[PDB]
From Swiss-Prot:
One GO CC term, this protein: ATP-binding cassette (ABC) transporter complex
Domain text: Accommodates the ligand side chains in large hydrated pockets which impose little specificity on binding. Tight binding is achieved by utilising the hydrogen-bonding potential of the main chain of the ligand.
Name of the protein in question: Periplasmic oligopeptide-binding protein OppA
Disulfide feature: C271-C417
Domain of life: Bacteria
Extra facts: Isothermal titration calorimetric measurements of the binding of lysine-containing peptides of different lengths to OppA show that the dipeptide Lys-Lys is bound with 60-fold lower affinity than related tri- and tetrapeptides (Lys-Lys-Lys and Lys-Lys-Lys-Ala, respectively).
A Pfam family reported for this protein in Swiss-Prot or TrEMBL: SBP_bac_5
Amino acid sequence: ADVPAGVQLADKQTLVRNNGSEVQSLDPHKIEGVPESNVSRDLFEGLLISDVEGHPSPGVAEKWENKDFKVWTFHLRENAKWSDGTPVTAHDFVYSWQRLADPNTASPYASYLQYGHIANIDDIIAGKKPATDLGVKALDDHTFEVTLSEPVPYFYKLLVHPSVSPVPKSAVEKFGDKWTQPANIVTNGAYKLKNWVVNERIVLERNPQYWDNAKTVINQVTYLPISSEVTDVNRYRSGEIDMTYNNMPIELFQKLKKEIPNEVRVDPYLCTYYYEINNQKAPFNDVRVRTALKLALDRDIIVNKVKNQGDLPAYSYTPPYTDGAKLVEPEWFKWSQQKRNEEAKKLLAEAGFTADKPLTFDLLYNTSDLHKKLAIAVASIWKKNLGVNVNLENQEWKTFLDTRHQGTFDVARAGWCADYNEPTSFLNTMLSDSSNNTAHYKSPAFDKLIADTLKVADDTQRSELYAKAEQQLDKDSAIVPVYYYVNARLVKPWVGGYTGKDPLDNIYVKNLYIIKH
């Protein structure tokens, strides 16, 4: 943290953050979500990290170079260490990226290495080559070299993500699935794990071996797993929580802005809220059905009437304010809802649906006041505007993600937040073979459009291809876009360091501090 001149620091430097749900895991190769990543940035540090405004900055690597954007050389700081005092080396990174690529690890982010185009990754994912053939190598203990199969000018931006963080081989091999328990875990970020009570709390304590430990201010941070946004707000206003999770309740939000305006932070956020359709499950494998659901959803009602929290109605997957996004707003989005409704009814009727045999399906959402209220409104809207019946189903976060990866659903509430600020951070999740493709969408045309983005060496041609890929996704109605999120959360007046300037919301508790109060 960089404490400004003159602020008096509180005597006790402790923080309580709500984290939206119980994490899937603490192993960087097994996680995918926002909650997971929130805890991961305090424990495990990759080559680069985001600074307080979100800029890619030095992490374990203090400096780096590239040769033609294809061979990237990272110089690791000599004093980077694990919480047990042992040095963090380029060998740790070699092992770790290999473990991420290995199909036996089954990471939901195995495709992060395809997004960066690390040499030989496709064959390793497919089992044709061993993970030791990955295009990474330690040139010495402090030098990690990555070789890509084609020029990727934005490659370094990917490197702040948890999946490319190092993991301690010796703990992994000796303890297996229990390497992340407090007694066994070894970490290289600003914090260490102290306590992990599933469905109660995660407590982290400062890691004195961290290279930048002298600038860390908060000594202990607790992450809670509360999925009720109303409950989060209640425990924040009672004094227990210092920062809520950034999912806000319909029951209380309006109230809060008027009651505690200085505590309500609302900033830009590169995430999109949508209904994920299982494209491989009939009858959702029919474009007419998908398109009907997309058009009959009334975004003005949902976004402005039912939620009304500063979110903008969405017509794309990639948020239009992503760096490099120059998207074409489709004609259906500018139409009146009435015209959208008649087109939806017509497509459904063409699909073979009648009043005697109506379209009936499940709407899955992870436990949340926000998601339940929005799914009840959407179910109503689809009933009224299109005559479809929906059965809502709630699941806890970890189960919900597994369900989506297994494809055991019809339609699911969903949100994707960028991992790096560039349109492929969204678009690469819709590639036929992406490990993050829970839409189960497979379009050879879409795949080709994205393949071609790195076959040009101009940002205008790249941007035009991203727009074409979004139009391809829209014409196929892979998803139902709902709104672009804003990052809204409550932050006590005494929590310093939270700028809200990073649109990826990659907070590090080592950057915050408690002001005397």
